[PDB]
Amino acid sequence: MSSSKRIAKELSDLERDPPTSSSAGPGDDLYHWQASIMGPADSPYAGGVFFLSIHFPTDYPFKPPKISFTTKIYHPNINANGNICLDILKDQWSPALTLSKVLLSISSLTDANPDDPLVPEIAHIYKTDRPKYEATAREWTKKYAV
């Protein structure tokens, strides 16, 4: 009744204005998307392009879409299940936040949030052991995100 027509326009906003470091869109399912993001140059992820699995909820506008990773990463706010410690989706999820805006907030992840230690072993390393953190992040970058 209302669910689908938002998605088409949010997708066509890509055709009207392509993004800088990302891309979006579906296979054939409307609610099954596959996003894109490339590791920032000013970050150990550099040299990494990521594969994303997206399933929209019953309401993409009225509810935050759960997002999972396909490519393994070495980051505190990310586990092996691709769970994203983005504070927008669960706390300040506005209906007006576009999928592009959500992709931008993902691209903000880079800036790690230490108070959310999804993997505390990596969180403490970010707290004190940034050198090996940066080395191993690029290690896994070249391992998975070619």
């Binding site: 470091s21 596959q34 894109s36 040299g47 070249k142 070619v146």
Partner: protein, 76 residues
């Protein structure tokens, strides 16, 4: 038809191709227009890496679409 190819530097080039062309043909055009070796070339479309044995019509590549090129390289 014209499409958009994005490199890791963000440099955007419009490539005038046809849907029947293969990805290998597109990478050859890229190497001709910039000299960049095709073996280092990794094309990204909507989070998908394409295959030189496959063609543009296979992955629903319409004109004026954006393709991301990834250069896998190691100075060491």
């Amino acid at each position: 038809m014209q499409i958009f190819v994005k490199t890791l530097t963000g440099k955007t080039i419009t490539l005038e191709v046809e849907p029947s062309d293969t990805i290998e043909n597109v990478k050859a055009k890229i190497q001709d227009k910039e000299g960049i070796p095709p073996d280092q070339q990794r094309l990204i479309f909507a989070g998908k890496q394409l295959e030189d044995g496959r063609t543009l019509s296979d992955y629903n590549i319409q004109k004026e679409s954006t393709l991301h090129l990834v250069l896998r390289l190691r100075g060491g």
